[PDB]
Design an enzyme around this catalytic site. Structure first.
Site, short mmCIF file in Angstrom:
data_model
loop_
_atom_site.label_atom_id
_atom_site.label_comp_id
_atom_site.label_asym_id
_atom_site.label_seq_id
_atom_site.Cartn_x
_atom_site.Cartn_y
_atom_site.Cartn_z
N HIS A 57 0.35 -1.38 -0.31
CA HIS A 57 -0.42 -0.27 -0.27
C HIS A 57 0.76 1.46 -0.07
O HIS A 57 0.60 2.48 1.36
CB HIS A 57 -1.06 0.17 1.49
N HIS A 95 -6.15 7.54 -1.96
CA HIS A 95 -7.44 6.82 -1.41
C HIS A 95 -6.22 5.51 0.05
O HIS A 95 -6.81 5.23 0.32
CB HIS A 95 -7.95 5.28 -2.33
MG MG Z 1 -6.61 0.11 1.21
ZN ZN Z 2 -5.46 0.71 -2.23
#
Ligand code: MG
Ligand code: ZN
Ligand code: D4L
Length: 302
Positions: A57, A95
């Site tokens: 991430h 995000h």
């Molecule tokens: Mg996520």
């Molecule tokens: Zn993501």
């Protein structure tokens, strides 16, 4: 931009490559092709700085998710407004802001302050909040040429899209969409339906690793499990037995876990998306191909 990237960026299975200093120009190209140039770059650099050095991430992930959105939007010309296209590409880039490689469940069990603040979709709410704060830095308001009404509007698009990357919400969203599709009641001119479709688009982009060619998809799997297994360790440090997915003790069952994930989440996701937006079919094909690869691994062929 290089001739090869100029061409290949139009492919759903495009990989953005290992050169970080190329990705901002990839995003800017995509978003121009779908702003105050100085503010935009400034905004991008601050977003990047708020991403963390975590295995999966991370900044690379964000641009990869944004690219998938780009490809969907290009191959569905005329469906989404100019605003929606801008908001969605920004939502994708932002995000996972400040992601530390742990799930909402761990933050809850840790009793992290963010879980007191945001009971549901904890990280996603924090990511939107981070996004708003970056927008509010001097020289960072990329939406300055918009009206207040359109400003409020685009932020709302962004908030809902970011919240939709919470995979806990996917299951009900897709179930509702599937029933709307099958009954013929799905209406893209209906804002609530439209928000759901955007939610599914956000899920499809976020998981797009599974829609790349096998050698990419195969290598990326190491990155997701490196995060998952570290969370399992931290869970064990809390005196809590983790779910198998996050237990490094169960790494030999990874192919079977991937099978589970593709059957329960990824195939249904791209299947529904392809039903609603036929030109997204390549995402589903590539997903199906990768499912087949995992099946070969288990047969001991791969
Ligand atoms: Mg996520
Ligand atoms: Zn993501
Ligand atoms: C590229 C990518 C992106 C997001 C992903 N999100 C998840 C949740 C998963 C995923 C991984 C995984 N591993 C599992 N096991 C490995 C060894 C023991 C089990 C199991 C699952 N999911 C099961 C599916 C059905 O419910 C029980 C969990 N997932 N999912 N893969 C992703 C891959």
């Amino acid at each position: 931009l290089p001739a090869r990237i100029c061409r290949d960026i139009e492919l759903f299975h495009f990989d953005i490559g290992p050169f970080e200093n190329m990705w901002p120009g990839i995003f800017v190209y995509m978003i121009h092709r779908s702003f105050e140039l100085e503010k935009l770059c400034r905004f991008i650099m601050s977003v990047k700085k708020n991403y963390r050095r975590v295995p999966y991430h991370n900044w690379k992930h964000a641009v990869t998710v944004a690219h998938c959105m780009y490809a969907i939007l290009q191959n569905n010309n005329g469906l989404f407004t100019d605003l929606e296209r801008k908001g969605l590409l920004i939502a994708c880039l932002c995000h996972d802001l400040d992601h530390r490689g742990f799930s909402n469940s761990y933050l809850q069990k840790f009793d992290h302050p963010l879980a007191a603040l945001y009971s549901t979709s904890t990280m996603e709410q924090h990511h939107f909040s981070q996004t708003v704060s970056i927008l509010q830095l001097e020289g960072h308001n990329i939406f300055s040429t918009l009206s207040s009404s359109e400003y409020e509007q685009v932020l709302e698009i962004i908030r809902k899209a970011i919240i939709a990357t919470d995979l806990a919400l996917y299951f009900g969203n897709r179930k509702q969409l599937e029933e709307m599709y099958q009954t013929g009641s799905l209406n893209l001119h209906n804002q609530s339906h439209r928000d759901r479709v955007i939610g599914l688009m956000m899920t499809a982009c976020d998981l797009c690793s599974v829609t790349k060619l096998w050698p990419v998809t195969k290598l990326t799997a190491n990155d997701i499990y490196a995060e998952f297994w570290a969370e399992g360790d931290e869970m064990k440090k809390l005196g809590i037995q983790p779910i198998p997915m996050m237990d490094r003790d169960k790494r030999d069952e990874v192919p079977q876990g991937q099978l589970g994930f593709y059957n329960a989440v990824a195939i249904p996701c791209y299947t529904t998306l392809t039903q609603i937006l036929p030109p997204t079919e390549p995402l589903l094909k590539a997903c199906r191909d990768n499912l087949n690869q995992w099946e070969k691994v288990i047969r001991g062929e791969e």
